[PDB]
Structure 1
Amino acid sequence: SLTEENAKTFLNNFNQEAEDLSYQSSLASWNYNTNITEENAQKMSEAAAKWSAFYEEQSKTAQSFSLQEIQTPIIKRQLQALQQSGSSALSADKNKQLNTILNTMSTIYSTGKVCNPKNPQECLLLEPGLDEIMATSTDYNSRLWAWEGWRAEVGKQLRPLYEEYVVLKNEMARANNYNDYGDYWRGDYEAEGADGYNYNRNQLIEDVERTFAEIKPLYEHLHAYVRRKLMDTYPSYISPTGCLPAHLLGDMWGRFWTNLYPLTVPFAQKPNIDVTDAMMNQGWDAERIFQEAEKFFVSVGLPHMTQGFWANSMLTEPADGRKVVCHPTAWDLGHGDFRIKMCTKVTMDNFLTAHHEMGHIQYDMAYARQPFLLRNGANEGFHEAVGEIMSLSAATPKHLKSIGLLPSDFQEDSETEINFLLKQALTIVGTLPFTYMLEKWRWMVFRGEIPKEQWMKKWWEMKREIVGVVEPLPHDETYCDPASLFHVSNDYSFIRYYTRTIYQFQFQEALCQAAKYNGSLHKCDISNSTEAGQKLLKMLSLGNSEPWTKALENVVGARNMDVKPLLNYFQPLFDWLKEQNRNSFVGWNTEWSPY
């Protein structure tokens, strides 16, 4: 009769219909992504519209229950997760303007070519024919020209769209009891209701700033070492004491330094042993790859996969008559249906990707016992963290030696260990400061601390001091540098990549100290360990029903971010970096400019 029973009945009625209505949309989307044709695309619209209309109607009707008299945490959490109205708080005309601005920005990012001072009949777009110069080309006057053209052609018209997008997002956030759009994004980390595990919205910022504080010397040493290694190819261009150039890196934006591995290598003579050229001599298949993945996954204490999983999943490329978008996905269709859509090849890259998707498959079925509203993560970082630890553990050299991939003659050597540590570092250490800087820039832009006439004054200088990257050519108050990313072009949250890496290291350490392991943190695995692997299964049963603080405290023992497995991971790498960088100058100054 009172509020609790009515709210429970409304939640039950909503969950009775949503579980059936969302399944149709999920199944149609899976069919489209697997069988993209002219009929699935138009079939998307009616299912999506029906599901969206039902969800909006339920969200509107989920307001007559006040959030003060609900004492149970489950129903309060369900009502709050059903209270978020999203963009419906905006006016119809304002929502139409926001939609058309987003569409225009997306279609501008989709198009866009470059102009060459040489023969201009060549056009280079976002096709992989353009990033090859930035990743593989080792000469000058091409990568810099490509970067300048990309920032000049599509970097001009993205400014007027962004000016209106910022204010519209701020208005939409303010319409939902928020201070700014950055506050709305940070609200995902806000959890209310606990006994010592309560977390505040602003504290996230505080939990970020000191995190970057503990990766100053390792990143500075990596910057100095990569600069010194680049000196040989560019003795007259790279300044020994100055910051690294914006271009000439291993990425368009310097986010990923993976392509810098061939140029920056400790010992090029090392074979860098790989067993990709080993499955042909004895016979292997993609089905065998998935069988090995599931056998390893059930060797830790995880349930065996369903029979229909192997029947509804695509593991090899179709012969003819069907087209696949060629993107690895792990669909949760609903009603106990799970599928993997990806093309599997004979390569350890596909092996690692299959294990990463298998981690998601294990995670998704692990919360099948929730009333359709708690079937998510406590925070947005848990989803991609599950697949990272499984991929890391199966990639360990000891793991490959347990399945016959490695002959029982070569055990371990130090030089290959250092090479592997460096190549793994130049995928995370080189991207953490960039992510932090971009997130901070966006946060001050949305807060209002950066004026519209000084944008192209704060984006660069921080990159000169936080990331250690200096521009090759001046940029005035007419360009829009940060809008050129695909992530930025649409409403994507970028802080998720900053925290998730921590979750990649925090869990694994806790999964290795319970396996009677005393060695290096980068050489431990959870194979053949029933206990080391039970903790993750126990924790993978709450989702967002409990605060992420409690789930973390019961899995790793740390209530907040205590991120120091990275230093234990790359410990020989840091020691070697300190040893090598002795007759040099570690650091950079925000005064030098190449031109």
Structure 2
Amino acid sequence: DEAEASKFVEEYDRTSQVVWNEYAEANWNYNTNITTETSKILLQKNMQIANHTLKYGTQARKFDVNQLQNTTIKRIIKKVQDLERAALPAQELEEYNKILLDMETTYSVATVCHPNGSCLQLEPDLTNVMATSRKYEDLLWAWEGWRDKAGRAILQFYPKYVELINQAARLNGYVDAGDSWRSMYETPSLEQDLERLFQELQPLYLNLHAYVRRALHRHYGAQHINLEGPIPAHLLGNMWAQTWSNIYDLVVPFPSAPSMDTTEAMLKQGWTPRRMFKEADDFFTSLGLLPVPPEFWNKSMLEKPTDGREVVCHASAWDFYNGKDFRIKQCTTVNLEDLVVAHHEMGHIQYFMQYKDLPVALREGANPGFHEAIGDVLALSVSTPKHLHSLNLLSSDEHDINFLMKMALDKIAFIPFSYLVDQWRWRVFDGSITKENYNQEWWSLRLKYQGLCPPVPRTQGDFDPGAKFHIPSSVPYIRYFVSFIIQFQFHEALCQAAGHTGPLHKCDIYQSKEAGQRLATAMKLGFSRPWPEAMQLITGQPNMSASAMLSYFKPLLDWLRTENELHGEKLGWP
């Protein structure tokens, strides 16, 4: 029986590589060239890979995992018994695949038009408006418009999507889709663990919120900002108010200490998307890590096509499962924000390359959070004023606070948002939130966790969650919350390994081979062992902890408390 098991795994692996490689090709062609033809081909490939999953999944379920001796064989087979969507009857499967495609397409080609005829796409048009406009009404137009066109358009598909993904989940032994997604962490205490982590970062977030609210009150007027209430969701420089670094100009702690226009600098010296990824590639190699293959530079879509072609612009990294072909698809814009995103994606590519020799079933991160954290860890070092200056993109306590504030506007503000998304979906999946209450519960969470309010009252028919990529694209979000916490834990450990001393926020692990070695050994494990082991390999301990992130921002937390205190701020929103 143990012999049939190792043989089954070998067969599953060699056949999966081929079928998955073909699927990736079709999926890539659609993503980088949305047409009726590429869509039709993708849906056909869905049926093919599903047929393969059903065949091997059915066989896998015939094994009594309890009797299997080899742990690795045991782990792979248990995983293969989960057919995911392939567990659905042929009819429901095709309907489910079409629904996913329709939601993705609808989101990626949606536009917001003006009376004249000027229509704006999310990237880069609407994104730019949200980031640079300081006019309440213009920000509102873009904010409401996007939700009117993308969000409302997704509502007709969601209820059916929920029914079908939940059905597939139950057919694989789970109570619902949320349960299925959470299982990716193999951590029974997950919900409680995440809640405790969230609570530890509350004091810092609430102080940042109150400080930013005061600055907005200063700029937009007392008639539009309640100093004791939530903040209008369209004033944070980002379409979803998930990161607030774009309004840094409105909240600079010490305006006397000017900061170079990084974007202007990048554009000034002709930085290009290719250059941006080249720099990222250099950071990884400086650590002794792997460089992307030549094939990467030739097949990746690092810029939005002018081809008159329609594509899915949202940044993503691709593993074509042949251990050679890896690509990135991103409509990269030349600015610091996208430079960080470029590192984020290159981090995914590094993970792909690091575990490319493990059985395909184990080719994943220790847990989804780890996969999201790698790139961010390096980006933390890249973002330091000193490193940016070394790239000729930049030119002291007050400078420390200004820097920490810029970092907090992104990293801290994102904590409650990243926590909220799946708290909403898990309740949709378990039936607690019906389609009658989709939007109302989304905003109750938006208020409860982020302390935000909608600038325009929502009405029946609105489906704001649909206006956030990951919702219609059905990509789990809790991984980003985990990532933001652990990436600081990794930063802390890597810096210590690099011999750094002094304030953690001043660390730059560039060229540190000791740092790279820890990330490499951890990444090489793929999904072969419980994630606490990969956590231990990198940090010397096995748990997730907010200590590193709090330590990184300590100087800022103290400054914020003193600042908010002297202005008599009332934290929170009664």
Q: Which residue of 2 aligns with 1:469?
A: 452
Q: Which stretch shows the higher mean deviation, 516-525 or 308-317?
A: 308-317
Q: Which stretch shows the higher mean deviation, 255-264 or 354-363?
A: 354-363
Q: Which residue of 2 aligns with 1:185?
A: 181
Amino acid in structure 1 at the alignment position of 2:371: H
Deviation of 1:490 after TM superposition, in Å, equals 3.2
Q: TM-score, normalised on structure 2?
A: 0.84
Is this contact kept in 2: 1:360–1:384, CA < 8 A?
Answer: yes
1:419-568 maps to which residues of 2 (within 5 A)?
419-450=402-433, 453-475=436-458, 479-568=462-551
Deviation of 1:418 after TM superposition, in Å, equals 1.8
Is this contact kept in 1: 2:152–2:463, CA < 8 A?
Answer: yes
Deviation of 1:48 after TM superposition, in Å, equals 6.1
1:170-181 maps to which residues of 2 (within 5 A)?
170-181=166-177
Shift of the 152–399 alpha-carbon distance from structure 1 to 2, 3 Å rule, reads closer
Deviation of 1:257 after TM superposition, in Å, equals 1.6
Shift of the 445–20 alpha-carbon distance from structure 1 to 2, 3 Å rule, reads closer
Deviation of 1:329 after TM superposition, in Å, equals 5.6
CA distance in 1, matches of 2:40, 2:522: 41
CA distance in 1, matches of 2:25, 2:483: 29
1:266-345 maps to which residues of 2 (within 5 A)?
266-273=253-260, 296-302=283-289, 308=294, 330-341=317-328
Shift of the 158–340 alpha-carbon distance from structure 1 to 2, 3 Å rule, reads closer
**SS of 2:471's equivalent?**
helix
**SS of 1:261's equivalent?**
helix
Deviation of 1:478 after TM superposition, in Å, equals 5.2
**SS of 1:505's equivalent?**
helix
1:110-129 maps to which residues of 2 (within 5 A)?
120-122=115-117, 124=119, 126-127=121-122, 128-129=124-125
**SS of 2:65's equivalent?**
coil
1:81-480 maps to which residues of 2 (within 5 A)?
81-106=79-104, 108-109=106-107, 120-122=115-117, 124=119, 126-127=121-122, 128-151=124-147, 158-159=154-155, 161-190=157-186, 199-200=187-188, 203-233=189-219, 234-273=221-260, 296-302=283-289, 308=294, 330-341=317-328, 352=340, 355-399=343-387, 405=392, 413-450=396-433, 453-475=436-458, 479-480=462-463
Is this contact kept in 2: 1:455–1:477, CA < 8 A?
Answer: no
Deviation of 1:530 after TM superposition, in Å, equals 3.2
Q: Which stretch shows the higher mean deviation, 144-153 or 522-531?
A: 144-153
CA distance in 2, matches of 1:164, 1:434: 25
Q: Work out which of the residue numbers 6, 10, 13 in structure 1 matches 2:11.
A: 13
CA distance in 2, matches of 1:259, 1:22: 39
Q: Which residue of 1 aligns with 2:572?
A: 588
Shift of the 365–151 alpha-carbon distance from structure 1 to 2, 3 Å rule, reads closer
Percent identity over paired residues? 41
CA distance in 1, matches of 2:563, 2:375: 34
* Structure with bigger gyration radius: 1
Q: State the number of aligned residues.
A: 569
CA distance in 2, matches of 1:313, 1:567: 40
Deviation of 1:424 after TM superposition, in Å, equals 1.4
Q: Which stretch shows the higher mean deviation, 559-568 or 320-329?
A: 320-329
**SS of 1:555's equivalent?**
helix
Is this contact kept in 1: 2:381–2:387, CA < 8 A?
Answer: yes
Q: Which residue of 2 aligns with 1:196?
A: none
Amino acid in structure 1 at the alignment position of 2:6: K
Shift of the 84–589 alpha-carbon distance from structure 1 to 2, 3 Å rule, reads same
Amino acid in structure 2 at the alignment position of 1:135: A
CA distance in 1, matches of 2:374, 2:447: 34
Deviation of 1:579 after TM superposition, in Å, equals 1.6
Compute the RMSD of aligned alpha carbons: 4.0
Is this contact kept in 2: 1:360–1:387, CA < 8 A?
Answer: yes
Q: TM-score, normalised on structure 1?
A: 0.82
Deviation of 1:290 after TM superposition, in Å, equals 6.9
Deviation of 1:393 after TM superposition, in Å, equals 2.2
Is this contact kept in 2: 1:328–1:340, CA < 8 A?
Answer: no
Q: Which stretch shows the higher mean deviation, 286-295 or 210-219?
A: 286-295
Is this contact kept in 2: 1:227–1:238, CA < 8 A?
Answer: yes
Deviation of 1:38 after TM superposition, in Å, equals 10
Deviation of 1:439 after TM superposition, in Å, equals 2.0
Amino acid in structure 2 at the alignment position of 1:247: H
Is this contact kept in 1: 2:317–2:348, CA < 8 A?
Answer: yes
Q: Which residue of 1 aligns with 2:65?
A: 67
